[PDB]
């Protein structure tokens, strides 16, 4: 039976309207150990010049790919958001700078014909620090405005390298997204709305405590206690840890659900631009108070609404 996210997002209902067939999704992550249920294809390794993206030594990319496009099975209730997509694996990050490799891999995924690009990477900077990523900005522009790729990126997780942003100050009408309060810049997160940046929520529909907040958060999706597929294409729900099993949590998995939705929206409305797919996803999200905020952006995605609601098309750009 179903992973809580599958039920929460009404994935089976959504898949009555599209499955992602004809769409290619690139997974810019730690690589993928492929399998019949996670049939990723080599999209390049940008960490090690040898290797091709089809090796996951971090128990991560494999699960990201499965959330987006893991095929169903008659013997368990797991299926990805869009089980009919082509999956390309670009290994761009690995624990077992990277902003330079990110620009390259974004261009490369676009050049491979990816129409949806999922980026797990979330680099954090002090707000005071001088940030130079002209070529990343150029890469994203190319991929989106020239190649017509929808790009979905992780909000980022709080941690050692990455401190939480305070909420906007309600007493400054002209800073509704709290730019003046930002302490940590997340990238490529801060490219939203050009890309779509995705925060994490728990089973209670509330923002995950580890989810990075900011003026750039565009949407949200399940990112806690998740189920996905492992190195064999079989259900997995934890990684082994020092004091026990660690559940599958991360804004990159949240991003992965949204990339999946984007591929569904793409199959169903093949003439929408990236900006229009993005708009369709955010316009049909369950909005927070105020309609937008720093934690969930436009709110938690709603795949069925995204696929079936009639909404004015936004600008094409």
């Amino acid at each position: 039976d179903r992973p809580w996210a599958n039920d929460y997002l009404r994935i089976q209902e959504a898949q009555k309207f599209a499955t992602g067939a004809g769409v290619t999704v690139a997974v810019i992550d730690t690589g993928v150990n492929g399998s019949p249920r996670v049939p990723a294809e080599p999209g390049g390794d940008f960490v090690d010049a040898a290797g091709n993206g089809m090796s996951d030594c971090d128990a991560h990319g494999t699960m990201t790919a499965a959330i987006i496009g893991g095929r169903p099975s008659p013997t368990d209730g797991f299926v990805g958001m869009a089980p009919d997509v082509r999956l390309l694996s670009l290994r761009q990050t690995s624990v077992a700078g990277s902003i330079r490799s990110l620009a390259r891999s974004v261009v490369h995924a676009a050049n491979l014909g990816a129409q949806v690009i999922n980026i797990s990477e979330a680099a954090c900077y002090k707000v005071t620090r001088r940030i130079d990523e002209t070529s990343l900005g150029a890469a994203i522009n190319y991929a989106v405005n020239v190649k017509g790729a929808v790009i979905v990126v992780a909000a980022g997780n709080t941690g050692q390298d990455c401190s939480q942003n305070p909420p906007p100050d309600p007493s400054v009408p002209s800073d509704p997204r709290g730019w003046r309060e930002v302490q940590t810049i997340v990238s490529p997160a801060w490219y939203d709305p050009l890309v779509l940046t995705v925060g994490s929520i728990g089973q209670n529909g509330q923002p995950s405590n580890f989810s990075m907040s900011g003026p750039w958060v565009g949407a949200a999706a399940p990112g806690e206690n998740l189920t996905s597929l492992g190195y064999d294409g079989q259900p997995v729900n934890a990684t082994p840890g020092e004091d026990g099993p660690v559940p599958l949590n991360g804004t990159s998995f949240s991003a992965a659900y949204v990339s999946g939705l984007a591929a569904l929206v793409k199959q169903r409305f093949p003439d929408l631009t990236p900006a229009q797919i993005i708009n369709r996803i955010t316009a049909t999200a369950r909005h927070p108070g105020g309609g937008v905020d720093n934690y969930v952006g436009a709110g938690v995605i709603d795949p069925v609404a995204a696929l079936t609601w009639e909404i004015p098309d936004g600008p094409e750009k």
């Binding site: 030594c57 699960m63 624990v95 996905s228 190195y231 079989q234 997995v236 729900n237 934890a238 990684t239």
Partner: peptide
């Protein structure tokens, strides 16, 4: 390389 992900039965 980290150990593979696993499945914990409910």
């Amino acid at each position: 390389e980290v150990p593979p992900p696993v499945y914990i039965p409910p």
